[PDB]
Structure formats: structure tokens, C-alpha cells
Amino acid sequence: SLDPCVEDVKRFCNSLRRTSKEDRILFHYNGHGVPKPTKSGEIWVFNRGYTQYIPVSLYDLQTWLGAPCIFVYDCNSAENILINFQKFVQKRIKDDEEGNHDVAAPSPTSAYQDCFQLASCTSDELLLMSPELPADLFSCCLTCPIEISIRIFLMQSPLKDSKYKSKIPNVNIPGMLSDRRTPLGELNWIFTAITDTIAWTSLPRPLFKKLFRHDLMIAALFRNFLLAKRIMPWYNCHPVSDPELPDSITTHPMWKSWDLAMDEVLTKIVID
Amino acid sequence: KLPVNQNILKNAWYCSQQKTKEDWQEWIRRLSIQLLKESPSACLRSCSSLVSVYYPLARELFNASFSSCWVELQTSYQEDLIQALCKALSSSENPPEIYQMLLNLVEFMEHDDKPLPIPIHTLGKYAQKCHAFAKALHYKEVEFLEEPKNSTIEALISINNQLHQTDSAIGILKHAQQHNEARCFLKQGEWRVCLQPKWRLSNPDSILGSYLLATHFDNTWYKAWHNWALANFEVISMLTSVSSSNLIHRHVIPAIKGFFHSISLSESSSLQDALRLLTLWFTFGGIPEATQAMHEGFNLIQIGTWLEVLPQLISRIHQPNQIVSRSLLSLLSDLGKAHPQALVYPLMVAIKSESLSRQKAALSIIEKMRIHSPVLVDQAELVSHELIRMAVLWHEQWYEGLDDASRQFFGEHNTEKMFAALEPLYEMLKRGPETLREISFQNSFGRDLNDAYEWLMNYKKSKDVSNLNQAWDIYYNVFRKIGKQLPQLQTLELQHVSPKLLSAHDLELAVPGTRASGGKPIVKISKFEPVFSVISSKQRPRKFCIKGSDGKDYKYVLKGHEDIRQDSLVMQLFGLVNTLLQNDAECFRRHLDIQQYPAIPLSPKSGLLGWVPNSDTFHVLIREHREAKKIPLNIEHWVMLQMAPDYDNLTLLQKVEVFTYALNNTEGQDLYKVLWLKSRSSETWLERRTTYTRSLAVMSMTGYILGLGDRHPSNLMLDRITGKVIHIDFGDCFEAAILREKFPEKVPFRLTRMLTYAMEVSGIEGSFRITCENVMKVLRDNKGSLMAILEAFAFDPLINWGFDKNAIRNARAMLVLKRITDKLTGNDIRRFNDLDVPEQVDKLIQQATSVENLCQHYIGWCPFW
Amino acid sequence: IDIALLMQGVSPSNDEYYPTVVIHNLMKILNDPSLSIHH
Amino acid sequence: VILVSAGYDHTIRFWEALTGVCSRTIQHSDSQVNRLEITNDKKLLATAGHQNVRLYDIRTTNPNPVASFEGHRGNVTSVSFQQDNRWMVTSSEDGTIKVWDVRSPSIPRNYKHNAPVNEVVIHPNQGELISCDRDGNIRIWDLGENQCTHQLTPEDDTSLQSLSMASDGSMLAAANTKGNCYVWEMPNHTDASHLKPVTKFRAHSTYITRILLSSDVKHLATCSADHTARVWSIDDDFKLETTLDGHQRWVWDCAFSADSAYLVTASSDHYVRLWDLSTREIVRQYGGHHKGAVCVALND
Amino acid sequence: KNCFSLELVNKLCFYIDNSEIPLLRQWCVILLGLLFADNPLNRFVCMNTGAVEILLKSLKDPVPEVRTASIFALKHFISGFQDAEVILRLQQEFEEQYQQLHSQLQHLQNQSHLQQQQSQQQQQHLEQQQMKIEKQIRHCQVMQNQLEVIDLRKLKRQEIGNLISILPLINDGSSLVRKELVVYFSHIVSRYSNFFIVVVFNDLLEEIKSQGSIFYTVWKSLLILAEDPFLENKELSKQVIDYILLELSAHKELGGPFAVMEKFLLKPMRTSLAKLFQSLGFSESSNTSMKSHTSKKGPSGHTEPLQLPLNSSFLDYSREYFQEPQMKKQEADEPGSVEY
């Protein structure tokens, strides 16, 4: 979508929900040229005139979408919207008693409570703005973990001296993700294993079965969410998921092994 | 905001108990110090103690504090401060101490932010009492504009007299009257040719004998040698007109020797002599005696003369005679030996020209330059080709190829001419990709062009009208998918257009543009700025920047797909006219100046124009002035369109009254007030008005003789510091606009109601007309030289751009010759009316200021402004 | 270059101009006599 | 009796003094109507607009244009009819005299001529044409000749505005942009170049528009661009009969009645008027024009 | 989009020029008023084709229903507040329809390029569809070419020219036309509010003691209608003026000055009031006002709130006509009944 409006986000949801009957739908929201989201439960969307921003309600967006959900928000204060969204869904399941209360919706209410989403920060605090960091580091975590992990490791390495470097290193990890033998694919496989062995020993058995034993898309998204949970609180952002992950996500002690792997691969790279 | 603290400043406002300059100054800085304590601004309340401690910064603060206090002060105290300032300006009338600064503050707030209700006559009288002559002049001009009085007129006359403005005083008086009511032989020859005309069989012999005797008495006398040579020129001209081919031999060699001797004597202004010699050699290059004459004159003449008089050599670089060609090749080889950096750009212009004889002749130039410096020409063409491909930006080729095909297909359906247009447009895609932007178009919009190509093939192989219509439908489709986003290229990035220009840095070539006298020093090039700004002139020209070796920036405006070199040839006409005004004592006293910008012909299809620095055009100059008042831009045009729904589609007579209605309803002094607004001070406004008047006068006369028309406020350009006018796009010349179909003109030079209202109260007949007689007399004083200049580029085939085989071109050029001679003499309208200089000035003024002469015009000329 | 320090009030407007003139006249205190007379 | 007016409304409209209100309006929102002329027996309506002369029908109920004819690159200025309506001519910004016919037209010959003329008039012999130019020139043409013509120069390179001609074949009056006019006497046997000038009158000093005179040769009424409508005598003592002013805007072309005693005035003052010249008083005043009115036609 | 065609609007103009029965003389004006709802392209096309002139001349007509219909249509002929966005909002689906029909055209061309003649068959049924699609496309770019020359300024000029010709129907016949006039005036108040706000201060301070425009004529005509002889029209005009009263009661910072000049009712600010005139004069981008009124009365300053653009139940009233019988005579005119 190219800087959309309310009429745009009408078919942005309707045209895909009318073709995905019950399969899950990914909804990415990237708001950074947009003001702060409303505590009352509104999301600002552009107009066609490029002069002011109009509200769109969570009911409006949800009714245009359907019951399965995987939502990724990249806004500033993504937490009033979650508190409100929990309030809206509990109010609609309270109205599910339905004396005369049934709002026409494209998908049944019984599949609303089991659809997943993420958040960007911990509360109404500020995002990251320094030139020493990507401006959309959250989705950098959720689509390219290895490269930004290497860059964050370089910028957090105390041994900055005797290295080949607003300052940002020109580091290039060779290869591609898919091939096993190349270093990039090797790092992808080692990251997948490392982020799975933390989750299996952290989360309970049925939560693990629900998260990492149903489908590959949610599997990969939640595996990158752990690295986000590692890096963002180092820049004061504590994201919130739909089920509450325990605080032992960042304190599980094999990030030493992550540091060892990063050290080894970068020493090999600089030697080569 | 403001507490109750105004009870203490009333005594400092109204005292009326002082009789000393020191006491008045004490009162003034006392009120200035206490003015800050009631200022509503946060940035002014805290500075009260600082101003009390230290005095001098209050002088520069004196505007902000007064502006803060005036708006906050109440209406009943407004007249109190009015009478306080009036009595302050009236007191101590003999010594001007600070009342000039008081009037400066008053005018400073009077600029735009609700001027004080002070009588303008009282302002003028305070200025006169306090010696502010220029402010008094402006005040009295306002008084005269409000109401014309004879006492006011004589006041401005006296003001001009004390300010040494004799032209302004005379014009004001005229407006008031019209509204309110060897050497002996040279002397003998010049008197003889004055009393009796030329073109007989006895006067040329007599003047030849007189010039020969003068040369014998003073063999080293420049005007004698030049006069003998030109006398032989007129004898040869009459012999050619009669035709003999035998009596020209006795005159070609004396003329050549005299011209060589005169050139060697002067070596300063040899432009006309050099071009005359070249025309003589090109007319008769088959005389062996002339061949050895110029061969032995090689040593006598220098190379710096040809260096200064380069361009016509490149213009006539094609030679039909072997001896002429060999002589010119030897001359240009000497030029390459002596500072070749001034001709490499016209050299590859000749390389990329369309004359196969010109490339065959220039192969020798290439070969002789290889033994000197291959790197110069190699880097020159490498940096050139990118600039031509970037001047004609890469979508414009097929854009114009679609447009020119489209309107002639709508006209008369010439499919063969369609195929001729589309044959070379598809060559380079199969030849090979070259640039990143070309790749960006290739991977985006190539398939539709391909499909159109085989639909053209199907039309050729079948003659199918339905598929022709389908091909024109897809042509409309691609025209849409180009023209929508065509105005969205506000800037061009050189890293993606042509990164090799960035790759080639520390360039050793000379900086293109202006040149010095003789052998100019070599200035290298550091790099290029990869960012450009696009101008909207129906062609999208761009702003090119060059980082030179001197650490500064050389900036130009880049034009494409045009043989602009006519502006280059008019540039030396500017050089000649500035030389003549410098030579004239009256023009030198008047300090006339025309600033010609550097402009090099990059190509037959590209060129550079010098953008004048620290200046703004009259087009832009009105926009911010209008939006400061928040009033509509095309206000008068909308007002008359309110009752003229078909202004453009209309006959001759009924446009006049609606135009008059627009003029009567619409005020037309925007430029006149904005020059006062942007003026730093009264003397600043004085120098702006002087520069503005004589610049527009001299430039409009030069345009009148040149035939330069099609002038509009877009190409009209003021100077921000001084106010001189600089024009662009001199393709229209020699009255070429009188022949084109689209609304031929009646006014020679654009002198509109805006210009008349921006003029002083003396009107168009004042200092403007007084400068007019001086310009006309100095231009008539050089009749022969200008004709010798203009005779060269008449019959040549590199000019037919504003007037469009060989005999037809010669006849058209000769009609242009008689037309311009009649235009100079004044007999262009009536044969019996042999009008002199002042009658010509009056006729031109009335014919240019007539409303009917300016109403009937094309909207592209923008006639209302 | 600048004959008088009032020319900078021409191009901008009236309202927001008030702190600008004060600030770009009082950033000149850095020299020694102003620093000595205003501590 | 019916009269019709047009202007900057892009709507031509008829009028009737008996009811005081407009009857029929026809939209022509493609160009500005310069002139219009109604056929003598009230059959077809022609006009001078832009590069097209079209023939409307009066008794039809506002249809599409019944006929249309093109052939002039520049805008057209005036149209000239015939009492037998066999040959229709127009004057445009080219000076090329054309000719067309009613009742299933074919393509006839077209005559090319320089000096783009302004107004034309057909002599009652229906074989001779006089055109006026804006350089003080009069072009005389006839169907008998092929390329020869006659040159008359009342003024030297001066913008002769228009002309008027006597239906009884006696007088020919001129109109100059400086307010000047010439009267030419031409007696019987009109098929000759014997236009004898008589006098010259400077009626005004500003720009002027078309002069019309009645069929009975006893008046000469002009109207100028200074809110002036001035009628003089042409056969009795040769003096000013009546001047008329008071119009809000400058008066455009005028028309007469059949009895040579009533005249209409159409101007750009969003109104049109009808006066009795004997009483020099308001007889009728029609309004409803949102914009100005430039051209008018009337017949009885 | 589907209904607006130039042939239809030209036939409508012909019918409203000369059709006998007043029912169509009603419904044609209603159809143009509905077509002028919010469509700047339609407003430009109708202005150019001159339906505005015909509908302006149809103000003077015998029956009052068509006069009220004409005022309803010129109520709809207000130019548009969200114009700079509705023009793009229409450009997008013209682009999309052009692309979709173009793709369908080449799809049908590829279908017809099946190397089968099929004489007197689907191909013969397809060529007429081919140039029908071509005609629809050509109509699409005709409207597309008319889009870019929109000229909101000329639209506003024609609106302000229509208002002054609406004005002389103040001395009309029925209270129906008077009510339609007061709701039209209320909508003018709703749209061009600030002109009313700047003129009311000057007018009532002069009553205590810039004007001169055609706007002052409408401002006075509202007060003229405020003394209507009918029942409902009086309180309707009072509720129209009540928005003005409530607005200048405060006008943010102006409430103090308004109260100060309000104490005179029983018995710097000049520049502040003058500054607001240019704020809309710039946004703009014969005149016989004649101000005649028997001022024998003065304005002393059922729904509780007030929506400023008033409703107009005339469309529902005209629609309710189509429920009374038409093939059979109604009650009280039967060959026998109570009223008979």
C-alpha cells in the first residue's frame, strides 16, 4: 500500500479476507510519519488531501479484517492500543450474551480470542532516534535478524579499535540464507537452534505446542521476537505479545554462547 | 503581557521644556531606555537592564522596540506619540543629529506594517529641514502623485539640481509643461565624401589618391591603412556588382597589405578587420597574388588576433578551395600551438556536426592534435557526450518522437514520416545499454515499445487500419504513462544518470565559459556537483554546477536539442556595443553598462547559458510581494475574464476595451513599491532607480536595432543589488517575430504600464528619452562598422531558425539587409519621411506606448504584464 | 557586506522575527569588552 | 415582427415587445458570437462566430444546427445575405470572398484575396460586392470578372472601421477608427465605378462600430464607443438630427425598423433598448442578459 | 457515473424548455439538482453545456412547484468544500476503469486471435462489442480530458452569479418557496460563514449608531424573511439566525467586545474585524441591492440544538406524490362518497 486512506484500508482488508476463507492473515502496520496512537482506541490514517490525519477505529479495522490474526505494529506507543484491544474484545464477548446484540461480522466471534499480534515498546515512552541505529529496528529484527545482530554486536563490541569500522560499519556477511554450507545460512541455522532451545526450556508445554508446533510463519515470527526481546530493552523497549511470555526470555544464560558464535564468525571473516 | 506601568513615560513623551541639542538627545535616549520596560515581547523585557547598562546596542534595537511598543500602545496615545515625534522633528531645525534616524525608523515601519497617519507634506518638510534630500524627494514624489502642484514640481527640480540629476530635472519640467501647461588629406577626403555621395567612377579614385598621399606622409598611421583597405573594398564591391575580374587584382593586394598593417599597428579591436579579411579571402581565394600576399603577411600578423576572433573560423571551417583549406588548416594549427584551450569545444561541435565535408576537413585537426595532446581531446569528448545526453534527457527523445509524429498524423497522416521518425529511436536498444537510467527505463517500459514496433511491422506488411488505430491507442497509453509522471522529476542525480562523470575527477581541461584577452590562463576542473535543479520552460532545462580548480563554483543553465549558437554570435555584438559605449565619452560619463554572461555552444543540440548571480527575475519578483498582502496573482486577468469568457477567440477591436477596463480597475505599481521595500535606504533607492532606468533604456534600444523581441517578465531579470536587466533566449532577432504566424507584433520593445508606473514622475519622456537621444546618436555614429559586422552571417545556412534554395536564402538575407538599414535610417514606414534621430525617438516612443500596438498579441508572450 | 543590521528584517515576517533579532545581536557578547562589562 | 440578440452569455435569444419577456434561447457555448443576421422572409438564421457559419431554423423547437459551413482559418466578422437567398457570403480575417447556397448545397468556386476585410455589402443588382479594410481601402468585386478589381483609398493607411450603403442605390458612407466618415454619391446605372465623394464628417474621435442606414435615404445613424448614438441627415440640410447618450456601457451594433423611425441599441450593459427616433425616448427595455450583448438582428 | 450522459442532459434541457405537463417540469429540475449533488466534473460539464442558464431562466414559471425545484437545484449547485480531495477521489477510479476496460479489450482481442474465422457466429457477435468497448473507452478519456480544466474559481463565480438572480423571488407567492428560500439561505450561512460573521458586527454596530456588496443584500433578505406572515417560517428564520447569534456571542476572543457593544442594544478592534475579510477574499482567487424594507419592526436578540445546514423535506414531499392513485380518481371526486 502506498500511503493509504480509509477507503484504501477498506479493500486492503476486505479483498484479502474475502479470498482467505479461514486461513490466517498477516497485517503489518508501519507508522512512523504518523502522530501518537490514541489512548481512546483510534489509529491515525492519511487523507487524500495530505493536510490532516483521520481516525480509524479498532472495530472498523477488525470488522474489515476477520477472525484469524497475525498483527505487527511498528508505532510509538503500541500499548494503550493493546490495553484497549483487550477491552474491546472482552466487551464484545460480554455482548455475546446477545439479547439483541449481534454486529454483522465476516467471521464468527468464537475465533477472535485466538489470533496473535505483537507490540513495539513497553508503555507511553519514546522510540529510538539516534543516527547510530536503523529507524525501523523492530521490523529489522522481525525480517533480517542476522545482519542487524552482526551490526549491533559490532557497535556493542568493546574492542572497537584495530577494526575496519553518524558512524555505521560497512560489514557484509557473505552468502545467502537458504544454502546450508554458506556462512549466512550456517548462521541462520545456528540462530534458529539457539532461539528454539531457549523457548522450549522457558515456556510451558502447551504454550510451546501452540506457538512453535503449528505453523512455520508464526514459528519464524516468534523466533525473531526473542531476539527483539533481547535487543530492544537494551534501548528501552519491552514489547508485549498476546500471551504473556515470562521475563526469563532475555535472562536465559546462553547469550554467552551467542557472543562466542559472533566472535568466532567475525574473527574468521576478518582473517579471510 | 503588559502590567500597568505607562504612568511614568508620559513625562518623557510630552516635556516641551528643552532648548538644547544635548537636552533633546538626553530626552531621546531616556525615552529609548525606558521604552523596553513596557515591551510585550519576552525577548525584549529582559533586555531593559542590559540597555540601561550599555547604550550602543539600543541603536540597532531601536526598530524592534518601536515595533513592539507601537502595536501595544492605545489609540488615544497614538496621536500623543504623533505630536511628540512631530515636535521632536521640528525642534533644532539647523543641526541634523538623529532626526534622520528618526525618519529612517518611521519609513522602516511605514514599509508594510500599517504606516503612521502622518501628513506626507509634513514628512517632506521634516526631511527638508533635516537635510534628508532623498527622503524629501520620495515624500515630494508621493505628494505630486497624490496631487500635482507647480511648487512641488519646482521642489523636485531643485532636488534633482542639488543631487546632480539634470536629466530628471529636465524631464520633470517637460512633464509639467506638457501636462499642467596626411591629416589635411584625410580632412579633404572626409569633407568630399560628406558633401558628395559615393558609387561613381571618379570619387573612388580621388579618395584612393588622398588616402595614398596620407599613407605616404604617415606610413604608420592606422586609420590611413584601414581607410585605404576599405576604399579598395568598396571599389571591389562595385566591380563585383558590375560584373571585369581584372581590375580587382590591382585592389585585392593593396587592401590585404593595408589590413595587415592596420592589424599589426592596433592588435586591440581587430574584430572587424579580421572578419573583413576572411570575407575577402573567402570571396576571392583563387588569386595567386593574393595567396603569396597573405602568405608573406603570415609573419607580419600574430596569432592572438585569430585567438580573439576565433568563432567565424569555426563557422566557416568548411572550405571549398584547396588553397583556402590549407591556409585555414595552417592557421588553426598555429592556434592549437598558441593556447588551444579556447577552441576544443567548437572543435568537437564541428566533429559532431552534420557536414561530412566538415568531418573530413577536421580529420586533419584530429591528426595534428594527436601529436600534441591526445588526452585533452579524449577527456573533452568523454566529458562532452555525457553532457549532451544529459541536456537532452533520456525520455525527451521518444517524447518528442511521439509528439511530432502525433500532430502531423492528425494533420495529414504521413505513415512514411512516422517510420522515418521511429527508425532511429529503436536502434540503441539493440545496439547496447549504456547507463543506469537507460536500464531503469528498459526494465520498466520496454514491452509496450516492442509491441508497437511489431504492430508497425504488421501495418507495413498488411496495411491494416484497425491495427493502426490499435497502435495509436497504445501510443496514447504510453504517452499517458510518460506524461503523467513527466513533471515529477524535480531533480536529476548524476550517479544514476551518468556516474562516469563523477568517476572522472581532477579534470585538466579549461573551464568552459568566458575568456580573457589574448591567451587566457588555464583553469582546471576539480569535480562536478551531481545535483541539479529543473526549470519549467516547456523543455525542462537544468542547473549545471562545476567545481573548478580555484575552489569556487561555476554554474550554468543547460539547454538541449537546439542550435543556440545565434546567441553566441550576438554575444560579440554585445562586446562591440559595450566597447563603443566605453569609447564614447558621454556614455562613459553616464556609466552605462550591459553585463553579458558567459555562454558556450556545447553542441548543435546542446549549450550552456550563464545564469547571472545574486539577482531575481521580474517573474518571481511579484509573487512574494503579492502573497505578503495575500491578494491573488492573476488578479487583473481574472477580473476581465469575469466578463470575457472568450478573450482568446476574439477579433481585433473588442479586446481593447476589456483590456482598458482591467487597467483602470487594477493598480499597477507593484514593482515600484517593492523596489522601495527592498531598498536598504533612500540613497540605495536612488542608485537602484538610476541603474534600472539607464539599463532598461540601453537594453531596449539594443533590442530595437537587433530585432530582439518576444520579451516577457520571465526572461526579464532584475539584479538584486543594482537592478540591471538581463535577458535570455535571443533566438528571435532581426524582427523575426513579424513574419511568424502566431500573432505578429506591433510594439518593438516591451514597455508596459508596469514599466511606466515604475518610472519616475517625469514619465517616459524624461531621463529615459534623454538617454534615448544619446544612445541613438552613439549608435548612428558607427554606421559602417555595424554593417560590416552584420554582413557576415546573412547568407550562411546556420541562421535559418527564426525566419524559415541557396538563391532563396540569399534573397531573404538581402531583404533582411534592406529592412534593417531602413529600420536604422527611419524610412521603414514612409519613403518621403526621412526622419532624423529625435523624430525617430518620438515615433518609436508613441508606437511602442500605443495600447493597440500591444493588445493584439499571443498569450504565450503574456501581453497583459 | 551589510551596511545596516536592519536589512535582515525585510525577507521574513513580523511575528516570529522578535526573538531572532535579539539572539543574533546578543550572540556577539563573546568579545572581551562585552564579556568584561556583562558577566 | 421578431428580433434576436446575442452577447457574452453564449446564448442567443429572441425578444418581443408585446410581452416584454424573452421567448426562445439557444445555447452556442463553443465560441463568442460576433454578429448575426435573420433571413428577410424569416426562414433561416445565420451568424458570424468562429471559423463556422451555421444556419438555424426559427420555427423549430431548439434543435441541433440545421446547416453549417466552414472554410475560413481566422475568425469571421460579418455575413451578407441575398433577397433571393441564392448566394450567401461572409467576411472574415482573411479577405477571401466565399459563396454558398441553400437547398442541398454543392461546392462552388472560392475567391482568394489579401488585405483581410472587415465588412461587406452587396449591391441590389446581386452581382457586385464592396468590402472595406482596416487600412482605408475599398475592394470592389463582381461575378463577371475573374481577377481584376477596383481600388479605392479614402484614407492613407488609416484603420477604416466599417461602411453602410443605401438600399435605393444613392449613398455610400464610411466609418473610420478616428471617428471620421465619408459620403459618396452614386447615381443610376450602378454597374460602374462612378462613386463620387461629396463631403467628410468627423462624427467622433474614439473607436466606432458599424453604421446602419434605412432603406429610405433620409437618415444616417452611427453609434460609437463613448456611449453615443448619433443620427444626422443625409438629404435634408445635412445637419445633426439627434444625439443619444446615458447608456451604462459602450453601445455595440444597432438595427432599424421598417418605417425608418425606430432603432434598437444593444450594448454590454446587460440590457438592450428600443427607441423612437422622433420622440428620442425610451420605448422598450429588455433585460435578462447575465453578461453583455454584442450583436443584434431584426426584420419585419 | 452511469446515468450522467450529455445526450440525456441535452434532452432534459429540451424538455424543460418545452414540455406541457408540469410533472416533468418538476422532475427534470429535480434530476439535475440530484446530479449536481457533489460532483465537480458534473458541475463543470453542466456549466459549459449551459444547463445552468436554462435552470436559471426556469425560475420564472407559472406553477410554484417548479420554482421551488429550481431553488432546490441551485441549493445543490454549491461548488464543494472537499473539492481538492473529491477531484482526486474521482480521478482514481477513472484511471482504474480505463485500465480495467483496456485490459478487457486486449483480453477480447487475444480471444478473437484464435485462428478461427467463425462466419455468422461469435466473431460476428463480437465486432459490435469491440467498438462498443472502444466507445466506452473514448467516453472515459473525454471525461478524463475534461477533468484537468476544472477551475473552482469559475465555479464560485457562477454560484455568486446565481445567488443574485435567486434574490428577486423574495416577493414570491407561496410559503413553500419562502421556506425553500430560507433553507437555501441557511445553507449559504453554513458554507460561507466568515463573511456573515464579519458583516454582522458592522451591520449591528451601525444599527447602534465594509458592506456595500451583494452579500449584504442576502444578509438583509434573511431579516426580511424573519418577518414572514406565515407560522412556521418565522421560527425557521429565527433558528437560522440563532446560529449567527450563538457564534458572535463569543467568537473566542471577541466575546468581551460583543458584550460591550451589546449593552448599547437597550439604548484595534477595527483592524481585528477588517483582517478577516481578506482571509476569504484571497480564497476566492446590475448590482441593484436597493435595500428597500419597511422597517416598522426590529429584531430583538421545536428542536433544542441546531444543525447549521438545514434539511429540506421537499424531495420526500415530491416522492410522496407517487402513492396517491393515478389510473383512478381519488377520494372526494368519486361518483359517490361522503364529500360527494
Residue numbers in the entry:
A (entry chain G): 148 to 312, 333 to 439
B (entry chain H): 1217 to 1397, 1716 to 1777, 1813 to 2373, 2414 to 2474
C (entry chain H): 901 to 939
D (entry chain I): 3 to 302
E (entry chain A): 732 to 940, 959 to 1016, 1069 to 1086, 1095 to 1110, 1132 to 1170
Paper text:
Target of rapamycin complex 1 (TORC1) is a protein kinase controlling cell homeostasis and growth in response to nutrients and stresses. In Saccharomyces cerevisiae, glucose depletion triggers a redistribution of TORC1 from a dispersed localization over the vacuole surface into a large, inactive condensate called TOROID (TORC1 organized in inhibited domains). The 3.9-Å-resolution structure of TORC1 from TOROID cryo-EM data together with interrogation of key interactions in vivo provide structural insights into TORC1-TORC1′ and TORC1-EGOC interaction interfaces. These data support a model in which glucose-dependent activation of EGOC triggers binding to TORC1 at an interface required for TOROID assembly, preventing TORC1 polymerization and promoting release of active TORC1.
To better understand the molecular regulation of TOROID (dis)assembly, we purified TORC1 from KOG1-TAP ∆tor1 cells grown PDS and acquired a high-resolution TOROID structure by cryo-EM. Using these particles for 3D reconstruction 45 resulted in a 3.87-Å map (FSC = 0.143), which enabled us to build a nearly complete structural model of yeast TORC1 in the TOROID. Moreover, the 3D reconstruction and local resolution estimation showed that the interactions between adjacent TORC1 units along the TOROID helix (intracoil) were more prominent than interactions along the helix z direction (intercoil), consistent with the resolution difference at the intracoil and intercoil interfaces. The overall yeast TORC1 structure extracted from TOROIDs was very similar to its mammalian counterpart (mTORC1). Tor2 in TOROIDs is structurally more like mTOR in nonactivated-state mTORC1 (r.m.s.d.inactive = 3.3 Å) than in Rheb-bound mTORC1 (r.m.s.d.active = 10.4 Å). Indeed, TORC1 in TOROIDs had an even more ‘open’ conformation than nonactivated-state human mTORC1: the HORN region of Tor2 made 10° and 24° outward shifts compared with nonactivated-state and Rheb-bound mTORC1, respectively. The Twix region is situated between α-helices 26 and 29 of Kog1 and interacts with the FRB′ domain of Tor2′ in an adjacent TORC1′ in the TOROID. In this vicinity, the structure displays several prominent molecular interactions leading to a robust TORC1-TORC1′ binding interface that we term the hub of interactions. This hub is centered around Trp2207, which sits between Arg884, Lys885 and Arg888 of Kog1, forming a prominent cation-pi interaction with Arg884 situated near the tip of the Tack α-helix and the base of the Twix region.
